[PDB]
Design an enzyme around this catalytic site. Structure first.
Site, PDB file in Angstrom:
ATOM      1  N   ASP A   1      49.989  56.285  32.632  1.00 38.83           N
ATOM      2  CA  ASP A   1      48.655  55.709  32.813  1.00 38.83           C
ATOM      3  C   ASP A   1      47.668  56.857  32.958  1.00 38.83           C
ATOM      4  O   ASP A   1      47.519  57.424  34.041  1.00 38.83           O
ATOM      5  CB  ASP A   1      48.606  54.799  34.038  1.00 38.83           C
ATOM      6  CG  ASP A   1      47.182  54.365  34.398  1.00 38.83           C
ATOM      7  OD1 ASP A   1      46.298  54.362  33.509  1.00 38.83           O
ATOM      8  OD2 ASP A   1      46.944  54.029  35.576  1.00 38.83           O
TER       9      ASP A   1
ATOM     10  N   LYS B   1      37.767  61.244  31.270  1.00 42.04           N
ATOM     11  CA  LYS B   1      38.062  60.101  30.416  1.00 42.04           C
ATOM     12  C   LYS B   1      36.801  59.424  29.894  1.00 42.04           C
ATOM     13  O   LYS B   1      36.855  58.767  28.849  1.00 42.04           O
ATOM     14  CB  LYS B   1      38.931  59.104  31.185  1.00 42.04           C
ATOM     15  CG  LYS B   1      39.338  57.860  30.400  1.00 42.04           C
ATOM     16  CD  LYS B   1      40.642  57.291  30.944  1.00 42.04           C
ATOM     17  CE  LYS B   1      40.669  55.771  30.891  1.00 42.04           C
ATOM     18  NZ  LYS B   1      41.837  55.208  31.635  1.00 42.04           N
TER      19      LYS B   1
ATOM     20  N   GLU C   1      45.774  49.073  28.216  1.00 42.46           N
ATOM     21  CA  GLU C   1      46.046  48.911  29.643  1.00 42.46           C
ATOM     22  C   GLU C   1      46.273  47.460  30.057  1.00 42.46           C
ATOM     23  O   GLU C   1      47.292  47.189  30.710  1.00 42.46           O
ATOM     24  CB  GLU C   1      44.911  49.569  30.442  1.00 42.46           C
ATOM     25  CG  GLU C   1      44.926  51.094  30.299  1.00 42.46           C
ATOM     26  CD  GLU C   1      43.704  51.776  30.891  1.00 42.46           C
ATOM     27  OE1 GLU C   1      42.833  51.074  31.440  1.00 42.46           O
ATOM     28  OE2 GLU C   1      43.615  53.022  30.804  1.00 42.46           O
TER      29      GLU C   1
ATOM     30  N   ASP D   1      40.789  44.403  36.633  1.00 43.79           N
ATOM     31  CA  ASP D   1      41.104  45.820  36.811  1.00 43.79           C
ATOM     32  C   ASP D   1      39.960  46.523  37.531  1.00 43.79           C
ATOM     33  O   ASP D   1      38.891  46.738  36.954  1.00 43.79           O
ATOM     34  CB  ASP D   1      41.396  46.486  35.466  1.00 43.79           C
ATOM     35  CG  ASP D   1      42.036  47.857  35.620  1.00 43.79           C
ATOM     36  OD1 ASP D   1      42.190  48.320  36.772  1.00 43.79           O
ATOM     37  OD2 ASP D   1      42.392  48.469  34.594  1.00 43.79           O
TER      38      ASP D   1
HETATM   39 MG   LIG Z   1      44.610  52.400  37.224  1.00 40.70          MG
END
Ligand SMILES: [Mg+2]
Ligand SMILES: Nc1ncnc2c1ncn2[C@@H]1O[C@H](COP(=O)(O)OP(=O)(O)O)[C@@H](O)[C@H]1O
Ligand SMILES: Nc1ncnc2c1ncn2[C@@H]1O[C@H](COP(=O)(O)OP(=O)(O)O)[C@@H](O)[C@H]1O
Ligand SMILES: Nc1ncnc2c1ncn2[C@@H]1O[C@H](COP(=O)(O)OP(=O)(O)O)[C@@H](O)[C@H]1O
Ligand SMILES: Nc1ncnc2c1ncn2[C@@H]1O[C@H](COP(=O)(O)OP(=O)(O)O)[C@@H](O)[C@H]1O
Ligand SMILES: [Ca+2]
Ligand SMILES: [Ca+2]
Ligand SMILES: [Ca+2]
Ligand SMILES: [Ca+2]
Ligand SMILES: [Ca+2]
Ligand SMILES: [Ca+2]
Ligand SMILES: [Ca+2]
Ligand SMILES: [Ca+2]
Ligand SMILES: [Ca+2]
Ligand SMILES: [Ca+2]
Ligand SMILES: [Mg+2]
Ligand SMILES: [Mg+2]
Ligand SMILES: [Mg+2]
Lengths: 380, 380, 380, 380
Positions: free
Chosen positions: B6, B67, B166, B188
């Site tokens: 991840d 990111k 994800e 999330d």
């Molecule tokens: Mg995470």
């Protein structure tokens, strides 16, 4: 859409992964199973029920249980050829050939006729052409027998995706690949053969741990037991031996299996074969009418039930396992529906056997599961 | 053995399919998560916690939240560069580069440092070398961002097997691919970003139906809320503004997140930062000691909780769905552990959210599931 | 009309949970904690964290680990009575009483008080008064001890739907009942007891093959190992014996446990006890401040780890099983979070333990599932 | 100490089952059948197949389809009383009685007799007397009708653990409770009723969204369509009206059902009723012998198929659902075995129905699962 196919010694079943779930398809005769029988009569060749329905009348041109010869060499099968009414001859390669009226076919060609009929009728039922299939074979088949079976599917016009084991196909259909560590005893009793397989399912490897069985023990032996009972009772009543008339014998085989099947759901049934023979003194018609109780049926088949124990015991010993160490017993084959077989399984292994999936559809369903997976399609 | 990774905006997690089950691995610092932070100090470069632990002291050489730039062109990111303390400059291609002391790195190179550290420490923990991985990316990433992420893994010395979403990885980890037809709202909430994904799971197709979120809403915003509360209470008590001393500010960030985490399991905790500042009149040491109740903590973060509703409502509308039509809500991100976020989810969708799997491990576990599958290994 | 709950009445902590939306949810108490210490103190009467926070200060009015005496006769727990600071006297019957300031109580009445707070505080999260529950007990409990636990629930005002084994409720939370036949070793290490249970889940039942453990091995012993180290190092550096001060010893105990929990997810933590003692010469304050690494923590607790081998090897021997013959090892108990413990399991059994579900909540979660199902609810 | 059972008390047939070795097993009765006709006859008193085999001969001493009157008041089933051959009179209360030769009985007492045979005969397969059961009822039953069904079980000597909906016990047997949220259309066609139920299985509950059906559409109507055809063809070929002879009509009814069951798995079957009537001119015997094809069978039952559309389209309209919005369609009831019915479902809903489990055993199987789970048993 890819399909699964159970090329069985007595019946064959086709199924397809429809909406994540295996669906067995009907043939042209409206039946979910197609007999593995080809009939070479003076005209269009018969494949399926119409072949099996005339097998006693046409012994030279009806090829049945071709699966006992597919992929073997003649020197290994000499004895089984003495047990069949049709001609079994060797080929230029040491192979097996069937000779009808002088013509010569291979067990792959006979098998391909059964497979073609299954795909033809299934393609009509689905409205799309079927070209890709997964075909199953007994766990004890070798590469020659696996390739010959794969050849039989190619000859029928199929793209063969994989040749997998029948007991694995059954475990797939019961979903035992989704229950972690399972030690599965597959109890396969079909038309003519009895097959015990011990599978070590765990971490995705289906490791065959033991095989045993009885190559001449199946539901047809129960059928003949009824036949001999019905003929003896008819000779005693009329002095007529119905086993000597191929036409009367063909109706006895047909009526016997029907009564057996009815006695899997009920305590008593009646076999009624009108106009079966002519009275020897008056030349008038004779009608067979007898009632078979399940109790008598079970007395007649007891020697078949007692022979179930051997292969089960030997497979446990060959695998170093106790009945208590078996994690699951699954019932495979149309013949495990006989309530007496089920009790015999309980008494042999001390466990309640899984009977969720139709026993004569479980292979074809698992094979279709495998097919859809190789093609991306999933399960539920 | 293949692994899942991840690559998160704040933390990164590595996991491996061990015995049909995903196991998350500890780093060199004994932690199941590695901060996605690289520090360029005058010496050996810092990657992970040691980098994050000095980020306030070293603003020019600490690269965090890389990111947000990976795979984008500069003309599209001009504003976010004004929000970071490190230098963000364009490349010969219109790309993004980070300039430390004049040297130039790409977000793929920064990311590759985080990935390399994860594989290095994991290879030590497993005693075998790790070369093959499945890396995850937000559902809204494009091919440029997916390839740049795949590049970051290759630069770290990895054979990249697949770049998956994800939210799909989360659904895999919760096993929702094994429950027929599921309509999944993935909720999330991580370190700095908030992500709502609606997945139409059915017949094996994971069809993303809607995305929404808040690119500046996460657990660090709760952290800063505690920081500003602690500094105001300290200015009022001593006339010292701890936010002006990079050393005191670095301990406040560290202590704030620790108290927040403790308040996810309990009603009250105490922040104690001894020798935090010098008394302006007597030059003697000052010790911060305040007690934070969860009740106060929730008052401080309420504006963050109230901003959760928007993205959820927009994703439902963008997908044409009602809360009642959602079949499952899964909680993703270390920040969904805040009991208040959980209540907010209940109130938004009227359903009890699945919290089975660790929220900060669920992506890495699903990615490792995907990896083992591509390599034949199975699940339980 | 109301929702039934499941309750783990543990030796050190007690946990309550319910099944909301087919989901097992552990509920917090009035103190906002998902575990309630199984301690009662009479000062007002104290039950839970408040009773635990003054247990060193009130050595004879604080009753703890009452589960050692419940359902048992005095003549059999005599030596265990000598190991506790509070008074344990035999009643008019062979039973067990605890005398505090002349006032007599029973293990059932003490347990009933722990239960009443759980139901009271939980009834306020749900908005309705809980009346029905499923309470768990160790697999080795006899009917007398199972009778007593149910009685403590009735005193508390509960309808006891069933008393099930803790190792069964764990397998429920982990879904082992849906994996055919599984042989499961349950590694249970809590505050003060170590329990090993071998199960064969199958054929409809949870067959207990073997039970083992250590009655005085748990997370609290790791706490005392940290306490004794801090006490000796302070002896060595300041000539003050903190273990001779109930006020300092109380703070040490409280701090040692917190350092332990932190060293489950990190390599290093710091204990800070300001104003912990006075200098014997100067009468000036002294502040403890020691940093404890996991490596030191793991060397302090090493003798405790060595005792984990015995019970596991005895249960395997008592079951006729090989570590390879164990299909799954599940991790239960707050102490199983310690990394050195998970490593010890890896080595003793050769497989990675299941830590997917919180080891301190898994039992109460199963009981929650067993209550919902007896109330016509099912798992989503 | 004993095993609890599940029981389907159906309008035409009743089924009993138990959960042995985590496996749901339907048990045979004294007549060796897995279904017991829901018929009682006073001649001695007859209950089951014997009572059904003389129902045409004894039109006023044979009580059948008592489920239409159970739990209901006379003033509401008045028109349904005019449609039956046996006497239906109101009791001193608003209730419903059936008068046979002056003797009064209640729907509960009639039902209780069906139940008593099931438990008696099943107790002999298991070797112990069954005392506890779970009985199913239509989703549309009110508390009065649910009260009555439980009373009929208590009369029979059973402890009624629970009264659950037939559509729920079907989803249990099919494992829909383990697939998160599923929207399920239950297509229930039995001996004499048609029932459509839309369920949303999720959030812990089986939410009934819509109920529909036809109170006079079932497998028995297909039977009468075959009877009327045989009767007219015999009228046409021999000038004898068999429907005017209770002895011939009884044989026709018995034979028509058997031909139907055979035409579920084959394209053609033959009805043979020797010595069925006498010639009106010659007083010589006449033998019926007609072959019936599925195509003719399907043309005789075509008007019945057309009535299947309405209830399905009404329930979808009553739920706000599209055939595409139905996740799964499960097949329940002996009549759903007819291929023309499965095809009608395929066309009305666009998906292949679930026939994995026997449609006449699936409900009793769920009830068996609901009894084992309330008794601490689980599914293997
Ligand atoms: Mg995470
Ligand atoms: N309901 C039933 N009861 C008893 N025997 C049955 C039943 N249905 C099929 N059989 C028998 O099972 C056999 C068919 O099994 P099958 O698995 O199709 O055979 P094979 O594997 O040998 O090709 C036949 O002997 C048939 O008579
Ligand atoms: N127990 C906890 N309670 C509350 N917040 C937590 C907890 N554990 C972690 N967090 C927060 O969650 C965030 C980490 O989530 P993560 O999924 O790792 O981030 P990202 O996806 O942004 O890389 C941080 O803000 C951290 O403080
Ligand atoms: N995250 C953690 N890391 C390390 N130890 C922990 C953690 N959580 C709890 N423990 C320890 O586990 C014990 C509590 O375990 P628990 O299952 O609640 O007890 P019991 O079942 O004996 O009543 C305590 O000694 C506590 O310090
Ligand atoms: N294999 C079959 N093929 C065709 N019809 C069948 C089959 N089995 C049962 N039926 C028919 O189904 C009906 C019985 O269904 P069942 O579920 O037992 O009834 P109910 O639920 O109404 O009490 C009868 O009319 C019977 O003829
Ligand atoms: Ca489906
Ligand atoms: Ca298993
Ligand atoms: Ca076993
Ligand atoms: Ca096993
Ligand atoms: Ca089993
Ligand atoms: Ca495993
Ligand atoms: Ca679903
Ligand atoms: Ca819904
Ligand atoms: Ca849905
Ligand atoms: Ca759900
Ligand atoms: Mg077969
Ligand atoms: Mg515990
Ligand atoms: Mg029914």
């Amino acid at each position: 859409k890819a399909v699964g196919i159970d090329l069985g010694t007595t019946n064959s079943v086709i199924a397809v992964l429809e909406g994540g779930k295996p669906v067995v398809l009907e043939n042209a005769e409206g039946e979910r199973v197609t007999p593995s029988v080809v009939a070479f009569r003076d005209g269009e060749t018969l494949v399926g029920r119409m072949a099996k329905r005339q097998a006693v009348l046409n012994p030279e041109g009806t090829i049945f249980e071709i699966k006992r010869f597919i992929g073997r060499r003649f020197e290994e099968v000499q004895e089984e050829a003495k047990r069949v009414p049709y001609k079994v001859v060797p080929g230029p390669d040491g192979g097996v050939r069937v000779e009808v009226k002088g013509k010569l076919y291979t067990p792959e060609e006979i098998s391909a006729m059964i497979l073609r009929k299954l795909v033809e009728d299934a393609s009509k039922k689905l409205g799309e052409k079927i070209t890709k299939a997964v075909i199953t074979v007994p766990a004890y088949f070798n590469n020659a027998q696996r390739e010959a079976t794969a050849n039989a599917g190619r000859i029928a016009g199929l793209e063969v995706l994989r040749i997998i084991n029948e007991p694995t196909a059954a475990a797939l259909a019961y979903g035992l690949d989704k229950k972690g560590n399972e030690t599965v005893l597959v109890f396969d009793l079909g038309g003519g053969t009895f097959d015990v397989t011990i599978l070590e399912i765990g971490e995705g490897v289906f490791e065959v741990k033991a095989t045993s069985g009885d190559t001449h023990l199946g539901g047809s032996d129960m059928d003949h037991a009824i036949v001999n009972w019905l003929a003896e009772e008819f000779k005693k009543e009329h002095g007529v031996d119905l086993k000597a008339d191929r036409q009367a014998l063909q109706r006895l085989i047909e009526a016997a299996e029907k009564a057996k099947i009815e006695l899997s759901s009920t305590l008593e049934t009646t076999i009624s074969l009108p106009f079966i023979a002519l009275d020897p003194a008056s030349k008038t018609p004779l009608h067979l009418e007898k009632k078979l109780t399940r109790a008598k049926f079970e007395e007649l088949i007891q020697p078949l039930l007692k022979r179930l124990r051997g292969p089960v015991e030997q497979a446990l010993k060959d695998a170093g396992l106790t009945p208590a160490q078996i994690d699951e017993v699954i019932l495979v084959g149309g013949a495990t529906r006989v309530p007496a077989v089920q009790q015999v399984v309980r008494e042999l292994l001390g466990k309640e056997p899984n009977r969720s999936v139709n026993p004569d559809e479980v292979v074809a369903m698992g094979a279709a599961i495998q097919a859809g997976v190789l093609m991306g399609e999933v399960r539920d």
